[PDB]
Design a protein around this ligand. Sequence first.
Ligand SMILES: [Mg+2]
Ligand SMILES: [Mg+2]
Ligand SMILES: [Mg+2]
Ligand SMILES: [Mg+2]
Ligand SMILES: [Mg+2]
Ligand SMILES: [Mg+2]
Ligand SMILES: [Mg+2]
Ligand SMILES: [Mg+2]
Ligand SMILES: [Mg+2]
Ligand SMILES: [Mg+2]
Ligand SMILES: [Mg+2]
Ligand SMILES: [Mg+2]
Ligand SMILES: [Mg+2]
Ligand SMILES: [Mg+2]
Ligand SMILES: [Mg+2]
Ligand SMILES: [Mg+2]
Ligand SMILES: [Mg+2]
Ligand SMILES: [Mg+2]
Ligand SMILES: [Mg+2]
Ligand SMILES: [Mg+2]
Ligand SMILES: [Mg+2]
Ligand SMILES: [Mg+2]
Ligand SMILES: [Mg+2]
Ligand SMILES: [Mg+2]
Ligand SMILES: [Mg+2]
Ligand SMILES: [Mg+2]
Ligand SMILES: [Mg+2]
Ligand SMILES: [Mg+2]
Ligand SMILES: [Mg+2]
Ligand SMILES: [Mg+2]
Ligand SMILES: [Mg+2]
Ligand SMILES: [Mg+2]
Ligand SMILES: [Mg+2]
Ligand SMILES: [Mg+2]
Ligand SMILES: [Mg+2]
Ligand SMILES: [Mg+2]
Ligand SMILES: [Mg+2]
Ligand SMILES: [Mg+2]
Ligand SMILES: [Mg+2]
Ligand SMILES: [Mg+2]
Ligand SMILES: [Mg+2]
Ligand SMILES: [Mg+2]
Ligand SMILES: [Mg+2]
Ligand SMILES: [Mg+2]
Ligand SMILES: [Mg+2]
Ligand SMILES: [Mg+2]
Ligand SMILES: [Mg+2]
Ligand SMILES: [Mg+2]
Ligand SMILES: [Mg+2]
Ligand SMILES: [Mg+2]
Ligand SMILES: [Mg+2]
Ligand SMILES: [Mg+2]
Ligand SMILES: [Mg+2]
Ligand SMILES: [Mg+2]
Ligand SMILES: [Mg+2]
Ligand SMILES: [Mg+2]
Ligand SMILES: [Mg+2]
Lengths: 46, 271, 93
Amino acid sequence: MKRTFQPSVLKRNRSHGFRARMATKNGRQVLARRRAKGRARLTVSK
Amino acid sequence: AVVKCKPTSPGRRHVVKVVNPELHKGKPFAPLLEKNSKSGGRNNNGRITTRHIGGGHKQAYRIVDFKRNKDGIPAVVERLEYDPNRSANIALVLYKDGERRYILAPKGLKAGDQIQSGVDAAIKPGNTLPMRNIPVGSTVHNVEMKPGKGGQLARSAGTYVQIVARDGAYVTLRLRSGEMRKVEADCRATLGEVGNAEHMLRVLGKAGAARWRGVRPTVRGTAMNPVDHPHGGGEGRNFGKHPVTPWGVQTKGKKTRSNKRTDKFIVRRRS
Amino acid sequence: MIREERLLKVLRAPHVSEKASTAMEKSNTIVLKVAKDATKAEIKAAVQKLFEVEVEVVNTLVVKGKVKRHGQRIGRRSDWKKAYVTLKEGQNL
RNA sequence: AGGACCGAACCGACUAAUGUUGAAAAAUUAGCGGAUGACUUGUGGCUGGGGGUGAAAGGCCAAUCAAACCGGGAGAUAGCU
RNA sequence: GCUCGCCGGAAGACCAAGGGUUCCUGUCCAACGUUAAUCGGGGCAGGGUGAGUCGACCCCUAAGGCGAGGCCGAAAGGCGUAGUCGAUGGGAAACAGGUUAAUAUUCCUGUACUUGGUGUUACUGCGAAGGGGGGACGGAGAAGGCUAUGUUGGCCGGGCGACGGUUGUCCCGGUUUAAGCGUGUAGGCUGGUUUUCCAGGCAAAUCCGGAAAAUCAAGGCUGAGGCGUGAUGACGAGGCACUACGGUGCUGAAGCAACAAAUGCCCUGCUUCCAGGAAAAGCCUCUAAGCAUCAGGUAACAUCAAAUCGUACCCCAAACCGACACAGGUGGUCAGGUAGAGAAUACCAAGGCGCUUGAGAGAACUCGGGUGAAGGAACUAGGCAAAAUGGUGCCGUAACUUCGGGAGAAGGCACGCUGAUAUGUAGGUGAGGUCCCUCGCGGAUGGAGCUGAAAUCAGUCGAAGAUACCAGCUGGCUGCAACUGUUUAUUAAAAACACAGCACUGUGCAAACACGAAAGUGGACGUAUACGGUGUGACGCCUGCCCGGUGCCGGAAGGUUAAUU
Ligand SMILES: [Mg+2]
Ligand SMILES: [Mg+2]
Ligand SMILES: [Mg+2]
Ligand SMILES: [Mg+2]
Ligand SMILES: [Mg+2]
Ligand SMILES: [Mg+2]
Ligand SMILES: [Mg+2]
Ligand SMILES: [Mg+2]
Ligand SMILES: [Mg+2]
Ligand SMILES: [Mg+2]
Ligand SMILES: [Mg+2]
Ligand SMILES: [Mg+2]
Ligand SMILES: [Mg+2]
Ligand SMILES: [Mg+2]
Ligand SMILES: [Mg+2]
Ligand SMILES: [Mg+2]
Ligand SMILES: [Mg+2]
Ligand SMILES: [Mg+2]
Ligand SMILES: [Mg+2]
Ligand SMILES: [Mg+2]
Ligand SMILES: [Mg+2]
Ligand SMILES: [Mg+2]
Ligand SMILES: [Mg+2]
Ligand SMILES: [Mg+2]
Ligand SMILES: [Mg+2]
Ligand SMILES: [Mg+2]
Ligand SMILES: [Mg+2]
Ligand SMILES: [Mg+2]
Ligand SMILES: [Mg+2]
Ligand SMILES: [Mg+2]
Ligand SMILES: [Mg+2]
Ligand SMILES: [Mg+2]
Ligand SMILES: [Mg+2]
Ligand SMILES: [Mg+2]
Ligand SMILES: [Mg+2]
Ligand SMILES: [Mg+2]
Ligand SMILES: [Mg+2]
Ligand SMILES: [Mg+2]
Ligand SMILES: [Mg+2]
Ligand SMILES: [Mg+2]
Ligand SMILES: [Mg+2]
Ligand SMILES: [Mg+2]
Ligand SMILES: [Mg+2]
Ligand SMILES: [Mg+2]
Ligand SMILES: [Mg+2]
Ligand SMILES: [Mg+2]
Ligand SMILES: [Mg+2]
Ligand SMILES: [Mg+2]
Ligand SMILES: [Mg+2]
Ligand SMILES: [Mg+2]
Ligand SMILES: [Mg+2]
Ligand SMILES: [Mg+2]
Ligand SMILES: [Mg+2]
Ligand SMILES: [Mg+2]
Ligand SMILES: [Mg+2]
Ligand SMILES: [Mg+2]
Ligand SMILES: [Mg+2]
């Protein structure tokens, strides 16, 4: 049966990529939170 | 020409169509075309603000000249064309200087007819004139609200306005709704009635015909749950309440006009 | 004109394999490991000047590094550029 | 001509059996409905939580819906076990 | 290796997405693989992806996103102009053969094509952020001309048969060739040309639009296919010689015709219908400031450049989405033979597989099937399930009806093979030759050859001729909903929702209404024959009484009455 995850690189990057996060103050706060925690991978971009 | 369809299929049994042989059969005049994409009733917030709109056939917009301010140049009717954007038909007119324009087609108009606009124009159907220079009692259409702004009243198929009185700087108009309204005498109007008066005699016959025109189904308030309509709820068919809009305003008889700015120009309500 | 140090830095190493030897024999084509940023023109000029030969065409491709494992961790070798540079059958490099 | 007829693809899901620590967190087999249309499908886009969307079942909104998910107030309060 | 079995509109082949080395070679079998494992998509090491023409990148825009100033908003921010991004759409160019263990339209061989910088020379009014043309567009349907492709014959090479016959009206195999270039055909559309004038194209125009005279009457654009060349080349059955047993080198015959024929092409065509069917750029053309023997444009020739990134492998799946080597899901293209209406179905071709536990036995019972005496719904909540009907042609077919239907109503007859009509018919296609011409892919003739239904009569075998697969059960009464549709993803598909039609009611446009602290936006580039809300629900016959209560609407005499003062 058709499941919930249907990958698409363009849609993934546009939804959750670095530039999508950087475009809004809430996204920049997401990035700041993840830097403070110390994540090795900030976003889906890499 | 009102033609009913033979009941060869259930969806064709009640279909009544308006077919005009005189209408053009080819493509429209391209330099007067412009795209008009659809909205689905959604505004710039993306929210549905007018229900029951969506789908339908792709349509091009035809730039129709509602101002008719090319004064003193005679023009000839080239052809009458179907317009998907409005009930009324439109006419392609060629001016003596080689300029081409679309106008609303009034009743009795045909290819080759002569039209003119201006103070010096004759009192013939299709001619645009200031209402100051149009006799009292004349039937007109494509009426202006403000001088030089463009026709805004009596534009639908078969519509018209009569000039009931003329006092000073204002004329009195009897609109299709029955309302008597005052407009400045310098506002222009077109002589005659809008054509295609049989437009209201057509019978769609099937639901898909309404879908072709971009109308989505209407769901009755009593058929849903109380959480999303005041009318909703009940074990079986129950109503027991005064009818209202989905937002709680009484929808049977309550007046909603509130415009004190334009109240002074209203001689009498439609009644 | 591409400067001297650019030409001296673009060429890294020659490729060696059965395909490389076959290319050299059959089609007079040497295969090289070139700089990741080296373009076809820079490669052509560098082979013309450092090896003293004549080139008519250069074909390039980027090799992707393999994912390997050393002591249960994860690692990836670097990508590198490979060049098929042909000579005009009169130099014998 | 047709929201026309029979019938594959395709979309669906009326019956029965099987399966029910399944081959499968909704399927298989034999039958079944639509199949030029209010059809079906690819790609991209828009609408955000007392809000959206709904040919309306309180349906659907990432296996979660009479108020999603994540984090915070927070060690809420619990005459109860 | 030889047999056997399975798929073959797929269980074969190829793209896109998604994944990322799973691809090839050597080596290992600890763990992983539902068993073993010498094997593997497992471990380890090495190798492998070659582009001016493919795609991305690039130019252009859609929905939509962002948005200098700006408008608005406690702040954060919202919206939006000029702009700038954004494909799922528009815009230049390459084909055939050979080659690797693994790449190829990328490498090699042969033959082409496109754009741009230049330079020389010949002639010359060039030039935009402007005008104009063009790009540029729906559904359905029908015919003709074709091709891919198939079949048969001819031709060429081979064969003379494990068991009766097989030198023939016999068996097997092959019979292939692209882009480009020349020809401009079936067919589609459009009258051509030159002068004179102009309230139009925000200014100009020699361009587009309009008006008028003159004259010629065929000009222009489009266009599958074929023919010729490309090609005295390539490839090609088979033999010749090696063989490390994988395969390698040389050589290589014939390489034609007729018929049949697409859902593909001509065709973005034609016909018709109403629901009336993107944008912008590339391209062509016109002028403006400006430059004006310079610059720039058109042409011929020569040289130079075409960068960068991707290219391995899976790709309807053991490699993507489902925790699995999971009976699930996943867009597009290719599409052979016999029978068949068919992309159904059966058996096969090319090609790919036998599904990663086996060996015995032949109890109950469970699952999936086959047959069944006599009876035939007696079963059961219920004919659930099963059994049955099933095709084509012809005959024939009731009540009722909105005159379309009901209707495939019901029911019945024929069906194989052989011969003859007719050494192959009705037809389809069509060479030779003959005549003509505004001569070529031409008009008339003409019929060789090929292909070819259906019918009738006669005979004949079987229990049975729509023999397999495939493929309606039928009729009578009645409730509900008019109907096609929609719905509780995952216990409810219905009488529920929707519907066309009807009515009430609001709404005069800066419309009512809705999303919004607002600016704005939708309604709508619509204007009362329109738009919103509510209820009813095709059609036919109709829709009676009550305004006391609640609500709504109208009114303003009188009483009561806020801030204020
Ligand atoms: Mg509505
Ligand atoms: Mg309605
Ligand atoms: Mg309900
Ligand atoms: Mg309520
Ligand atoms: Mg009740
Ligand atoms: Mg009651
Ligand atoms: Mg090359
Ligand atoms: Mg149908
Ligand atoms: Mg049906
Ligand atoms: Mg469903
Ligand atoms: Mg099934
Ligand atoms: Mg059907
Ligand atoms: Mg309920
Ligand atoms: Mg859910
Ligand atoms: Mg709550
Ligand atoms: Mg607290
Ligand atoms: Mg607690
Ligand atoms: Mg074997
Ligand atoms: Mg690996
Ligand atoms: Mg392998
Ligand atoms: Mg072992
Ligand atoms: Mg094992
Ligand atoms: Mg391996
Ligand atoms: Mg490349
Ligand atoms: Mg935009
Ligand atoms: Mg700003
Ligand atoms: Mg904005
Ligand atoms: Mg752009
Ligand atoms: Mg694209
Ligand atoms: Mg390969
Ligand atoms: Mg052919
Ligand atoms: Mg088709
Ligand atoms: Mg490949
Ligand atoms: Mg398996
Ligand atoms: Mg599977
Ligand atoms: Mg599908
Ligand atoms: Mg099949
Ligand atoms: Mg197994
Ligand atoms: Mg048994
Ligand atoms: Mg049994
Ligand atoms: Mg049986
Ligand atoms: Mg038996
Ligand atoms: Mg029996
Ligand atoms: Mg019996
Ligand atoms: Mg019986
Ligand atoms: Mg009984
Ligand atoms: Mg009993
Ligand atoms: Mg049954
Ligand atoms: Mg049965
Ligand atoms: Mg009853
Ligand atoms: Mg129904
Ligand atoms: Mg139905
Ligand atoms: Mg359910
Ligand atoms: Mg169900
Ligand atoms: Mg407004
Ligand atoms: Mg009802
Ligand atoms: Mg009813």
